Amino acid sequence: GEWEIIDIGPFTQNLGKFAVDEENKIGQYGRLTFNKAIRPCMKKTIYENEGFREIKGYEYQLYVYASDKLFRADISEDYKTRGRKLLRFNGPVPPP
């Protein structure tokens, strides 16, 4: 896959809010209230394989404050329909 840094504009903030909303469904962490996504944000392009390099989707690796605590969330987005899923949500983590 390929890696690119993206900034922290509304698209990225909405990824952050998505992650918190999704994590709140799970209820393993106390209820979280989204604060903001911060830098750095990474967008990975996910190929089905290197042999043909057909894009399958993307993964976004975000740092997001919620309830004044810093978390790392990874979000997948499929290439065809741009639907999104929360893969992983971990922390608190130290500030990058």
Side-chain angles (χ1 to χ4, degrees), residues 1-49 51-96:
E2 258 99 309
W3 300 88
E4 72 184 278
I5 291 169
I6 65 173
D7 209 70
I8 54 158
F11 182 80
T12 302
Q13 297 303 321
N14 278 303
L15 281 166
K17 184 173 160 172
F18 171 85
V20 176
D21 287 346
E22 287 299 302
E23 195 52 33
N24 282 336
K25 300 187 152 139
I26 296 175
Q28 292 172 353
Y29 285 101
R31 176 153 292 266
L32 293 166
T33 119
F34 167 81
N35 303 133
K36 63 185 178 184
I38 63 171
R39 300 192 184 92
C41 178
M42 289 221 60
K43 173 181 181 184
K44 186 195 181 178
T45 294
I46 304 286
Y47 301 108
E48 156 125 336
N49 49 238
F52 299 103
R53 284 174 66 91
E54 165 188 7
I55 300 171
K56 204 202 300 172
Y58 305 106
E59 277 196 41
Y60 298 93
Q61 291 179 192
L62 270 76
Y63 280 93
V64 57
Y65 279 108
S67 298
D68 302 298
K69 287 170 216 73
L70 190 61
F71 298 95
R72 270 280 295 109
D74 302 327
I75 293 159
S76 66
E77 176 181 78
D78 71 293
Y79 190 51
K80 291 184 317 183
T81 72
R82 305 306 170 92
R84 51 179 62 167
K85 300 180 189 164
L86 176 68
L87 297 181
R88 290 175 289 277
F89 191 104
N90 288 108
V93 298

Coordinates of all heavy atoms in Angstrom, one line a residue, unseen atoms left out:
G1 N 0.8 -1.3 0.0 CA 0.0 0.0 0.0 C 0.8 1.3 0.0 O 2.0 1.2 0.3
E2 N 0.2 2.4 -0.3 CA 0.8 3.7 -0.4 C 0.4 4.5 0.8 O -0.8 4.4 1.3 CB 0.4 4.5 -1.6 CG 1.4 4.5 -2.7 CD 1.1 3.5 -3.7 OE1 0.9 2.3 -3.4 OE2 1.1 3.9 -4.9
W3 N 1.2 5.4 1.3 CA 1.0 6.3 2.4 C 1.0 7.7 2.1 O 1.9 8.2 1.4 CB 2.0 5.9 3.5 CG 2.0 4.5 3.9 CD1 2.6 3.5 3.3 CD2 1.2 4.0 5.0 NE1 2.3 2.3 4.0 CE2 1.5 2.6 5.0 CE3 0.4 4.5 5.9 CZ2 0.9 1.7 5.9 CZ3 -0.2 3.7 6.8 CH2 0.1 2.3 6.8
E4 N 0.1 8.5 2.6 CA 0.1 10.0 2.4 C -0.4 10.7 3.7 O -1.3 10.2 4.3 CB -0.7 10.4 1.2 CG -2.2 10.3 1.4 CD -2.9 10.6 0.1 OE1 -3.1 11.8 -0.2 OE2 -3.3 9.6 -0.6
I5 N 0.3 11.8 4.0 CA -0.2 12.6 5.1 C -1.4 13.5 4.6 O -1.3 14.1 3.6 CB 0.9 13.5 5.6 CG1 1.9 12.7 6.3 CG2 0.3 14.6 6.6 CD1 3.1 13.4 6.6
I6 N -2.5 13.5 5.4 CA -3.5 14.5 5.1 C -3.7 15.4 6.2 O -3.4 15.1 7.4 CB -4.9 13.8 4.7 CG1 -5.4 13.0 5.9 CG2 -4.7 12.9 3.5 CD1 -6.8 12.4 5.7
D7 N -4.3 16.6 6.0 CA -4.4 17.6 7.1 C -5.6 17.4 7.9 O -6.2 16.3 7.9 CB -4.3 19.0 6.5 CG -3.7 19.9 7.6 OD1 -2.5 19.8 7.9 OD2 -4.5 20.8 8.1
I8 N -6.0 18.4 8.7 CA -7.1 18.2 9.8 C -8.4 19.0 9.5 O -9.0 19.5 10.5 CB -6.5 18.4 11.2 CG1 -5.7 19.7 11.3 CG2 -5.5 17.2 11.5 CD1 -5.6 20.1 12.8
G9 N -8.7 19.2 8.2 CA -9.9 19.9 7.8 C -11.2 19.1 8.1 O -11.1 18.0 8.7
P10 N -12.3 19.6 7.7 CA -13.7 19.0 8.1 C -13.8 17.5 7.7 O -14.4 16.8 8.5 CB -14.7 19.8 7.3 CG -13.9 20.8 6.4 CD -12.5 20.9 7.0
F11 N -13.2 17.1 6.6 CA -13.3 15.7 6.2 C -12.6 14.8 7.3 O -13.1 13.8 7.7 CB -12.5 15.5 4.9 CG -12.6 14.0 4.4 CD1 -13.7 13.6 3.7 CD2 -11.5 13.2 4.6 CE1 -13.7 12.2 3.3 CE2 -11.5 11.9 4.2 CZ -12.6 11.4 3.5
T12 N -11.5 15.3 7.8 CA -10.7 14.6 8.8 C -11.4 14.6 10.1 O -11.5 13.7 10.9 CB -9.3 15.2 8.9 OG1 -8.7 15.1 7.6 CG2 -8.4 14.4 9.9
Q13 N -12.0 15.8 10.5 CA -12.7 16.0 11.7 C -13.9 15.0 11.7 O -14.3 14.4 12.7 CB -13.2 17.4 11.9 CG -12.0 18.4 12.1 CD -11.1 18.1 13.2 OE1 -11.5 17.6 14.3 NE2 -9.8 18.3 13.0
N14 N -14.6 14.9 10.6 CA -15.7 14.0 10.4 C -15.3 12.5 10.5 O -16.1 11.7 11.1 CB -16.5 14.2 9.2 CG -17.5 15.4 9.4 OD1 -18.4 15.3 10.3 ND2 -17.4 16.4 8.6
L15 N -14.1 12.2 10.1 CA -13.6 10.8 10.4 C -13.4 10.6 11.9 O -13.7 9.5 12.4 CB -12.2 10.6 9.7 CG -12.3 10.3 8.2 CD1 -10.9 10.4 7.5 CD2 -12.9 8.8 8.0
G16 N -12.9 11.6 12.6 CA -12.7 11.6 14.0 C -14.1 11.4 14.8 O -14.2 10.6 15.7
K17 N -15.1 12.2 14.3 CA -16.4 12.1 14.9 C -17.0 10.7 14.7 O -17.6 10.1 15.6 CB -17.3 13.2 14.4 CG -18.7 13.3 15.0 CD -19.4 14.6 14.5 CE -20.9 14.5 14.7 NZ -21.4 15.9 14.3
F18 N -16.8 10.2 13.4 CA -17.3 8.9 13.1 C -16.7 7.9 14.1 O -17.4 7.0 14.6 CB -16.9 8.5 11.7 CG -17.1 7.1 11.3 CD1 -18.3 6.6 10.9 CD2 -16.0 6.1 11.4 CE1 -18.5 5.2 10.6 CE2 -16.2 4.8 11.1 CZ -17.5 4.3 10.7
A19 N -15.4 8.0 14.3 CA -14.7 7.0 15.2 C -15.2 7.0 16.6 O -15.5 5.9 17.1 CB -13.1 7.2 15.2
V20 N -15.5 8.1 17.1 CA -16.0 8.3 18.5 C -17.4 7.7 18.5 O -17.7 6.9 19.4 CB -15.9 9.8 19.0 CG1 -16.5 9.9 20.4 CG2 -14.4 10.2 19.0
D21 N -18.2 8.1 17.5 CA -19.6 7.6 17.5 C -19.6 6.1 17.5 O -20.4 5.4 18.2 CB -20.3 8.1 16.2 CG -20.7 9.7 16.4 OD1 -20.6 10.2 17.5 OD2 -21.1 10.3 15.3
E22 N -18.8 5.5 16.6 CA -18.7 4.0 16.5 C -18.2 3.4 17.8 O -18.8 2.4 18.2 CB -17.8 3.7 15.4 CG -18.4 3.9 14.0 CD -19.6 3.1 13.8 OE1 -19.6 1.9 13.8 OE2 -20.7 3.7 13.5
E23 N -17.2 4.0 18.4 CA -16.6 3.4 19.7 C -17.7 3.5 20.8 O -17.9 2.5 21.5 CB -15.4 4.2 20.1 CG -14.6 3.5 21.1 CD -14.2 2.0 20.8 OE1 -14.1 1.6 19.7 OE2 -14.1 1.2 21.8
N24 N -18.5 4.6 20.8 CA -19.6 4.7 21.8 C -20.7 3.6 21.6 O -21.4 3.3 22.6 CB -20.2 6.1 21.7 CG -19.4 7.1 22.4 OD1 -18.6 6.8 23.4 ND2 -19.5 8.4 22.1
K25 N -20.8 3.0 20.5 CA -21.7 1.9 20.3 C -21.2 0.6 21.0 O -22.0 -0.2 21.5 CB -21.8 1.5 18.8 CG -22.3 2.6 18.0 CD -22.6 2.1 16.6 CE -23.7 3.0 16.0 NZ -23.4 3.3 14.6
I26 N -19.9 0.5 21.2 CA -19.3 -0.7 21.7 C -19.4 -0.7 23.2 O -19.6 -1.8 23.8 CB -17.8 -0.8 21.2 CG1 -17.7 -0.9 19.7 CG2 -17.0 -1.9 21.9 CD1 -16.3 -0.9 19.0
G27 N -19.1 0.5 23.8 CA -19.3 0.7 25.2 C -18.2 0.0 26.1 O -18.5 -0.2 27.3
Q28 N -17.1 -0.3 25.5 CA -16.0 -0.8 26.4 C -15.2 0.3 27.0 O -14.7 0.1 28.1 CB -15.0 -1.7 25.5 CG -15.6 -3.0 25.1 CD -14.6 -3.8 24.1 OE1 -13.6 -3.2 23.7 NE2 -15.0 -5.0 23.8
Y29 N -15.0 1.4 26.4 CA -14.6 2.6 27.0 C -15.8 3.4 27.6 O -16.9 3.2 27.1 CB -13.9 3.6 26.1 CG -12.5 3.1 25.6 CD1 -12.3 2.5 24.4 CD2 -11.4 3.4 26.5 CE1 -11.0 2.1 24.0 CE2 -10.1 3.0 26.1 CZ -9.9 2.4 24.9 OH -8.7 2.0 24.5
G30 N -15.6 4.1 28.7 CA -16.7 5.1 29.1 C -17.1 5.9 28.0 O -16.4 6.1 27.0
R31 N -18.4 6.4 28.0 CA -18.9 7.3 27.0 C -17.9 8.4 26.7 O -17.5 9.1 27.6 CB -20.3 7.8 27.3 CG -20.9 8.8 26.2 CD -22.4 8.9 26.1 NE -22.9 7.6 25.6 CZ -23.2 7.3 24.3 NH1 -23.0 8.3 23.4 NH2 -23.7 6.1 24.0
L32 N -17.6 8.6 25.4 CA -16.7 9.6 24.9 C -17.4 10.8 24.2 O -18.3 10.5 23.5 CB -15.6 9.0 24.0 CG -14.7 8.0 24.7 CD1 -13.9 7.1 23.6 CD2 -13.7 8.7 25.6
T33 N -16.9 12.0 24.5 CA -17.4 13.1 23.7 C -16.3 13.6 22.8 O -15.2 14.0 23.3 CB -18.3 14.2 24.4 OG1 -17.8 15.5 24.4 CG2 -18.7 13.8 25.8
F34 N -16.5 13.6 21.5 CA -15.5 14.0 20.5 C -15.1 15.4 20.8 O -15.9 16.3 21.0 CB -16.2 13.8 19.1 CG -15.4 14.5 18.0 CD1 -14.3 13.8 17.5 CD2 -15.8 15.7 17.5 CE1 -13.6 14.4 16.4 CE2 -15.0 16.3 16.5 CZ -14.0 15.7 16.0
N35 N -13.8 15.7 20.7 CA -13.2 17.0 20.8 C -12.7 17.5 19.4 O -13.2 18.4 18.8 CB -12.1 17.1 21.9 CG -12.6 16.6 23.3 OD1 -11.9 15.9 24.0 ND2 -13.7 17.2 23.7
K36 N -11.7 16.7 18.9 CA -11.0 17.1 17.6 C -10.0 16.1 17.2 O -9.4 15.4 18.1 CB -10.3 18.5 17.8 CG -9.2 18.5 18.8 CD -8.6 20.0 19.0 CE -7.5 19.9 20.1 NZ -7.0 21.2 20.4
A37 N -9.9 15.9 15.9 CA -8.7 15.2 15.3 C -7.5 16.2 15.2 O -7.7 17.4 15.0 CB -9.1 14.7 13.9
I38 N -6.4 15.7 15.6 CA -5.1 16.5 15.5 C -4.1 15.9 14.5 O -4.3 14.7 14.0 CB -4.4 16.6 16.9 CG1 -4.0 15.2 17.4 CG2 -5.4 17.3 17.9 CD1 -3.1 15.3 18.6
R39 N -3.1 16.6 14.2 CA -2.0 16.1 13.3 C -1.1 15.1 14.1 O -1.0 15.2 15.3 CB -1.1 17.3 12.8 CG -1.9 18.3 12.0 CD -1.0 19.3 11.2 NE -1.9 20.3 10.6 CZ -2.3 21.4 11.1 NH1 -1.9 21.8 12.3 NH2 -3.2 22.1 10.4
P40 N -0.5 14.1 13.4 CA -0.6 13.8 12.0 C -1.7 12.9 11.6 O -2.0 12.0 12.5 CB 0.7 13.1 11.6 CG 1.1 12.4 12.9 CD 0.5 13.2 14.1
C41 N -2.4 13.0 10.5 CA -3.3 12.0 10.0 C -2.7 11.3 8.7 O -2.2 12.0 7.8 CB -4.7 12.7 9.6 SG -5.9 11.5 8.9
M42 N -2.8 10.0 8.7 CA -2.3 9.2 7.6 C -3.4 8.5 6.8 O -4.2 7.9 7.4 CB -1.2 8.2 8.1 CG 0.1 8.8 8.6 SD 1.5 7.8 8.0 CE 1.1 7.9 6.2
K43 N -3.3 8.6 5.5 CA -4.2 7.9 4.6 C -3.4 6.8 3.9 O -2.5 7.2 3.1 CB -4.8 8.9 3.6 CG -5.7 8.2 2.5 CD -6.3 9.3 1.6 CE -7.2 8.7 0.5 NZ -7.6 9.8 -0.4
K44 N -3.8 5.6 4.1 CA -3.1 4.4 3.4 C -4.0 4.0 2.2 O -5.2 3.8 2.4 CB -2.9 3.3 4.3 CG -2.1 2.1 3.8 CD -2.4 0.8 4.7 CE -1.6 -0.3 4.1 NZ -1.7 -1.5 5.0
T45 N -3.5 3.8 1.1 CA -4.2 3.2 -0.1 C -4.0 1.7 0.0 O -2.8 1.2 0.1 CB -3.7 3.7 -1.4 OG1 -4.0 5.1 -1.5 CG2 -4.3 3.0 -2.6
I46 N -5.1 0.9 0.0 CA -5.1 -0.5 0.2 C -5.3 -1.2 -1.2 O -6.4 -1.1 -1.7 CB -6.2 -0.9 1.3 CG1 -6.1 -0.2 2.7 CG2 -6.4 -2.5 1.4 CD1 -4.9 -0.7 3.6
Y47 N -4.3 -1.9 -1.7 CA -4.5 -2.7 -2.9 C -4.9 -4.1 -2.7 O -4.6 -4.7 -1.6 CB -3.1 -2.7 -3.7 CG -2.7 -1.4 -4.1 CD1 -1.6 -0.8 -3.5 CD2 -3.4 -0.6 -5.1 CE1 -1.2 0.5 -3.9 CE2 -3.0 0.7 -5.4 CZ -1.9 1.2 -4.8 OH -1.5 2.5 -5.2
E48 N -5.7 -4.7 -3.6 CA -6.1 -6.1 -3.5 C -4.8 -6.9 -3.4 O -4.7 -7.9 -2.6 CB -7.1 -6.6 -4.5 CG -7.0 -8.1 -4.8 CD -8.3 -8.9 -4.6 OE1 -9.2 -8.4 -3.9 OE2 -8.4 -10.0 -5.2
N49 N -3.8 -6.6 -4.3 CA -2.5 -7.2 -4.3 C -1.5 -6.3 -5.1 O -1.9 -5.4 -5.8 CB -2.5 -8.6 -4.9 CG -3.2 -8.7 -6.2 OD1 -4.2 -9.5 -6.3 ND2 -2.8 -7.9 -7.2
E50 N -0.2 -6.5 -4.9 CA 0.8 -5.7 -5.6 C 0.9 -6.1 -7.1 O 1.2 -5.2 -7.9 CB 2.1 -5.8 -4.9
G51 N 0.6 -7.4 -7.4 CA 0.7 -7.8 -8.8 C -0.1 -7.0 -9.8 O 0.3 -6.7 -10.9
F52 N -1.3 -6.6 -9.3 CA -2.3 -5.9 -10.2 C -2.6 -4.5 -9.7 O -3.1 -3.6 -10.5 CB -3.5 -6.7 -10.5 CG -3.3 -8.0 -11.1 CD1 -3.4 -9.2 -10.4 CD2 -3.0 -8.1 -12.5 CE1 -3.1 -10.4 -11.0 CE2 -2.8 -9.3 -13.1 CZ -2.8 -10.5 -12.3
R53 N -2.3 -4.2 -8.5 CA -2.5 -2.9 -7.9 C -3.9 -2.3 -8.1 O -4.0 -1.1 -8.5 CB -1.4 -1.9 -8.3 CG -0.1 -2.2 -7.5 CD 1.1 -1.3 -8.1 NE 0.9 0.1 -7.8 CZ 1.3 0.7 -6.7 NH1 1.9 0.1 -5.8 NH2 1.1 2.0 -6.6
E54 N -4.9 -3.1 -7.9 CA -6.3 -2.7 -8.0 C -6.6 -2.1 -6.6 O -6.3 -2.8 -5.6 CB -7.2 -3.9 -8.3 CG -8.8 -3.6 -8.0 CD -9.7 -4.8 -8.1 OE1 -9.2 -5.9 -8.3 OE2 -10.9 -4.6 -8.0
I55 N -7.1 -0.9 -6.5 CA -7.4 -0.2 -5.2 C -8.7 -0.9 -4.7 O -9.7 -1.0 -5.3 CB -7.6 1.3 -5.4 CG1 -6.3 1.9 -5.9 CG2 -8.0 1.9 -4.0 CD1 -6.5 3.4 -6.3
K56 N -8.6 -1.3 -3.4 CA -9.6 -1.9 -2.7 C -10.3 -0.9 -1.7 O -11.5 -1.0 -1.5 CB -9.0 -3.1 -1.8 CG -10.1 -4.1 -1.4 CD -9.6 -4.9 -0.2 CE -8.3 -5.6 -0.3 NZ -7.9 -6.2 1.0
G57 N -9.5 0.0 -1.2 CA -10.0 1.0 -0.3 C -8.9 1.8 0.3 O -7.8 1.7 -0.2
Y58 N -9.2 2.4 1.4 CA -8.3 3.2 2.1 C -8.4 2.9 3.6 O -9.4 2.5 4.1 CB -8.6 4.7 1.9 CG -8.7 5.1 0.5 CD1 -9.9 5.4 -0.1 CD2 -7.5 5.3 -0.3 CE1 -10.0 5.7 -1.5 CE2 -7.6 5.6 -1.6 CZ -8.8 5.9 -2.2 OH -8.9 6.2 -3.5
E59 N -7.3 3.2 4.3 CA -7.3 3.2 5.7 C -6.9 4.6 6.2 O -5.9 5.1 5.6 CB -6.5 2.1 6.3 CG -7.2 0.8 6.3 CD -6.6 -0.3 7.2 OE1 -6.1 0.1 8.3 OE2 -6.5 -1.4 6.8
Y60 N -7.6 5.1 7.2 CA -7.2 6.4 7.8 C -6.7 6.2 9.2 O -7.4 5.6 10.0 CB -8.3 7.4 7.8 CG -8.9 7.8 6.4 CD1 -9.9 7.1 5.8 CD2 -8.3 8.8 5.7 CE1 -10.4 7.4 4.6 CE2 -8.8 9.2 4.4 CZ -9.8 8.4 3.9 OH -10.3 8.8 2.6
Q61 N -5.5 6.7 9.6 CA -5.0 6.5 10.9 C -5.1 7.9 11.6 O -4.4 8.8 11.1 CB -3.6 6.0 10.9 CG -3.4 4.6 10.5 CD -2.0 4.1 10.5 OE1 -1.6 3.1 9.9 NE2 -1.1 4.9 11.0
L62 N -5.9 8.0 12.6 CA -6.2 9.3 13.2 C -5.8 9.4 14.6 O -5.9 8.3 15.3 CB -7.7 9.7 13.1 CG -8.2 10.5 11.9 CD1 -8.3 9.5 10.7 CD2 -9.5 11.2 12.1
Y63 N -5.3 10.5 15.1 CA -5.2 10.8 16.5 C -6.4 11.7 16.8 O -6.7 12.7 16.1 CB -4.0 11.7 16.8 CG -2.7 10.9 16.9 CD1 -1.9 10.7 15.8 CD2 -2.3 10.4 18.1 CE1 -0.7 10.0 15.9 CE2 -1.1 9.7 18.2 CZ -0.3 9.5 17.1 OH 0.9 8.8 17.3
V64 N -7.2 11.3 17.8 CA -8.4 12.1 18.1 C -8.6 12.2 19.6 O -8.5 11.2 20.4 CB -9.7 11.4 17.5 CG1 -9.8 9.9 18.0 CG2 -11.0 12.1 17.9
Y65 N -8.8 13.5 20.1 CA -9.2 13.8 21.4 C -10.7 13.6 21.6 O -11.5 14.1 20.8 CB -8.9 15.2 21.8 CG -7.4 15.4 22.2 CD1 -6.5 16.1 21.4 CD2 -7.0 15.0 23.4 CE1 -5.2 16.3 21.8 CE2 -5.6 15.2 23.8 CZ -4.8 15.8 23.0 OH -3.5 16.0 23.4
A66 N -11.0 12.8 22.6 CA -12.4 12.7 23.1 C -12.4 12.7 24.6 O -11.6 12.0 25.2 CB -13.0 11.4 22.5
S67 N -13.4 13.4 25.2 CA -13.4 13.5 26.6 C -12.0 13.9 27.2 O -11.6 13.4 28.2 CB -13.9 12.3 27.3 OG -15.3 12.0 26.9
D68 N -11.4 14.8 26.5 CA -10.0 15.3 26.9 C -8.9 14.3 27.1 O -7.9 14.5 27.8 CB -10.2 16.2 28.1 CG -11.1 17.3 27.9 OD1 -10.8 18.1 27.0 OD2 -12.2 17.3 28.5
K69 N -9.1 13.1 26.4 CA -8.2 12.0 26.3 C -7.8 11.7 24.9 O -8.6 11.8 24.0 CB -8.8 10.8 27.0 CG -8.9 10.9 28.5 CD -9.7 9.7 29.0 CE -10.6 10.2 30.2 NZ -11.8 11.0 29.9
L70 N -6.5 11.4 24.7 CA -6.0 11.2 23.3 C -6.1 9.7 22.8 O -5.5 8.8 23.4 CB -4.6 11.8 23.0 CG -4.1 11.9 21.6 CD1 -5.0 12.7 20.7 CD2 -2.7 12.4 21.6
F71 N -6.7 9.5 21.7 CA -6.9 8.1 21.2 C -6.4 7.9 19.8 O -6.3 8.9 19.0 CB -8.3 7.6 21.3 CG -8.9 7.6 22.7 CD1 -9.6 8.7 23.1 CD2 -8.8 6.5 23.5 CE1 -10.2 8.7 24.4 CE2 -9.3 6.5 24.8 CZ -10.1 7.6 25.2
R72 N -6.0 6.7 19.4 CA -5.6 6.3 18.1 C -6.7 5.5 17.5 O -7.1 4.4 18.0 CB -4.3 5.6 18.1 CG -3.1 6.4 18.0 CD -2.9 6.8 16.5 NE -2.5 5.7 15.7 CZ -3.3 5.2 14.7 NH1 -4.5 5.7 14.5 NH2 -2.9 4.1 14.0
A73 N -7.3 6.0 16.4 CA -8.4 5.2 15.7 C -8.0 5.0 14.2 O -7.4 5.9 13.6 CB -9.7 6.0 15.8
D74 N -8.2 3.8 13.8 CA -8.1 3.4 12.4 C -9.4 3.2 11.7 O -10.2 2.4 12.3 CB -7.2 2.2 12.2 CG -5.8 2.4 12.9 OD1 -5.3 3.5 12.9 OD2 -5.3 1.4 13.4
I75 N -9.7 3.8 10.6 CA -11.0 3.7 9.9 C -10.8 3.2 8.5 O -9.9 3.7 7.8 CB -11.6 5.1 9.9 CG1 -11.9 5.6 11.3 CG2 -12.9 5.1 9.0 CD1 -12.0 7.1 11.4
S76 N -11.6 2.3 8.1 CA -11.4 1.8 6.7 C -12.5 2.4 5.9 O -13.6 2.7 6.4 CB -11.6 0.2 6.7 OG -12.9 -0.1 7.0
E77 N -12.2 2.7 4.6 CA -13.2 3.2 3.6 C -13.1 2.4 2.4 O -12.0 2.2 1.8 CB -12.9 4.7 3.4 CG -13.7 5.4 2.3 CD -13.2 6.8 2.2 OE1 -12.2 7.0 1.5 OE2 -13.8 7.7 2.7
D78 N -14.2 1.8 1.9 CA -14.1 1.0 0.7 C -14.1 1.9 -0.6 O -14.8 2.9 -0.6 CB -15.2 -0.1 0.5 CG -16.5 0.4 0.3 OD1 -17.1 1.1 1.2 OD2 -17.1 0.2 -0.9
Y79 N -13.3 1.4 -1.6 CA -13.1 2.3 -2.7 C -14.3 2.4 -3.6 O -14.6 3.5 -4.2 CB -12.1 1.5 -3.6 CG -11.5 2.3 -4.8 CD1 -11.0 3.6 -4.6 CD2 -11.5 1.8 -6.1 CE1 -10.5 4.3 -5.6 CE2 -11.0 2.5 -7.1 CZ -10.4 3.7 -6.9 OH -9.9 4.5 -8.0
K80 N -15.1 1.4 -3.7 CA -16.3 1.4 -4.6 C -17.5 2.3 -4.1 O -18.0 3.1 -4.9 CB -16.8 0.0 -5.0 CG -15.8 -0.7 -5.9 CD -16.4 -2.1 -6.3 CE -17.1 -2.9 -5.2 NZ -17.6 -4.3 -5.6
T81 N -17.8 2.1 -2.8 CA -19.0 2.8 -2.3 C -18.7 3.9 -1.3 O -19.6 4.7 -0.8 CB -20.0 1.9 -1.7 OG1 -19.5 1.3 -0.5 CG2 -20.3 0.7 -2.7
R82 N -17.4 4.0 -0.8 CA -16.9 4.9 0.1 C -17.7 4.8 1.5 O -17.7 5.8 2.2 CB -17.0 6.4 -0.4 CG -16.2 6.6 -1.8 CD -14.7 6.1 -1.8 NE -14.2 6.2 -3.1 CZ -13.6 7.2 -3.7 NH1 -13.3 8.3 -3.0 NH2 -13.1 7.1 -5.0
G83 N -18.2 3.7 1.8 CA -18.7 3.3 3.1 C -17.6 3.2 4.1 O -16.4 3.0 3.7
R84 N -17.8 3.4 5.4 CA -16.7 3.4 6.3 C -17.0 2.5 7.6 O -18.1 2.3 7.9 CB -16.3 4.9 6.7 CG -17.4 5.8 7.1 CD -16.8 7.2 7.5 NE -16.2 7.9 6.4 CZ -15.9 9.2 6.5 NH1 -16.2 9.9 7.6 NH2 -15.3 9.8 5.5
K85 N -15.9 2.0 8.1 CA -16.0 1.1 9.3 C -14.9 1.5 10.3 O -13.8 1.8 9.9 CB -15.8 -0.3 8.9 CG -16.8 -0.9 8.0 CD -16.6 -2.3 7.7 CE -17.4 -2.8 6.5 NZ -17.0 -4.1 5.9
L86 N -15.2 1.4 11.6 CA -14.1 1.6 12.6 C -13.3 0.2 12.8 O -13.9 -0.8 13.1 CB -14.7 2.0 13.9 CG -13.6 2.2 15.0 CD1 -12.6 3.3 14.7 CD2 -14.4 2.4 16.4
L87 N -12.0 0.3 12.5 CA -11.2 -1.0 12.6 C -10.7 -1.2 14.0 O -10.8 -2.3 14.6 CB -10.0 -0.9 11.7 CG -10.4 -0.9 10.2 CD1 -9.1 -0.9 9.3 CD2 -11.3 -2.0 9.8
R88 N -10.2 -0.1 14.6 CA -9.4 -0.1 15.9 C -9.5 1.2 16.5 O -9.6 2.2 15.8 CB -7.9 -0.4 15.6 CG -7.6 -1.8 15.1 CD -6.2 -2.0 14.7 NE -5.9 -1.3 13.4 CZ -6.2 -1.7 12.2 NH1 -6.7 -2.9 12.0 NH2 -5.8 -1.0 11.2
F89 N -9.6 1.2 17.9 CA -9.7 2.4 18.7 C -8.9 2.1 19.9 O -9.3 1.2 20.7 CB -11.1 2.8 18.9 CG -11.4 4.1 19.5 CD1 -11.9 5.2 18.7 CD2 -11.1 4.4 20.9 CE1 -12.1 6.4 19.3 CE2 -11.3 5.6 21.4 CZ -11.8 6.7 20.6
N90 N -7.8 2.8 20.2 CA -6.9 2.4 21.3 C -6.4 3.7 22.0 O -6.3 4.8 21.4 CB -5.7 1.7 20.8 CG -6.0 0.2 20.4 OD1 -6.0 -0.1 19.2 ND2 -6.3 -0.6 21.4
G91 N -6.1 3.5 23.3 CA -5.5 4.6 24.1 C -6.1 4.7 25.5 O -6.8 3.7 25.9
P92 N -5.9 5.8 26.2 CA -5.1 7.0 25.7 C -3.7 6.7 25.3 O -3.0 5.8 25.8 CB -5.2 7.9 27.0 CG -6.4 7.5 27.7 CD -6.4 6.0 27.5
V93 N -3.2 7.5 24.4 CA -1.9 7.4 23.8 C -1.2 8.7 24.1 O -1.8 9.8 24.3 CB -1.9 7.2 22.3 CG1 -2.6 5.9 22.0 CG2 -2.6 8.4 21.6
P94 N 0.2 8.7 24.2 CA 0.9 10.0 24.3 C 0.8 10.9 23.1 O 0.7 10.4 22.0 CB 2.3 9.5 24.6 CG 2.4 8.1 24.1 CD 1.1 7.5 24.1
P95 N 0.8 12.2 23.3 CA 0.8 13.1 22.2 C 1.9 13.0 21.3 O 3.1 12.8 21.7 CB 0.8 14.5 22.9 CG 0.2 14.2 24.2 CD 0.8 12.9 24.6
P96 N 1.7 13.0 19.9 CA 2.7 12.7 18.9 C 3.6 13.9 18.7 O 3.4 15.1 19.2 CB 1.9 12.4 17.7 CG 0.6 13.2 17.8 CD 0.3 13.3 19.3

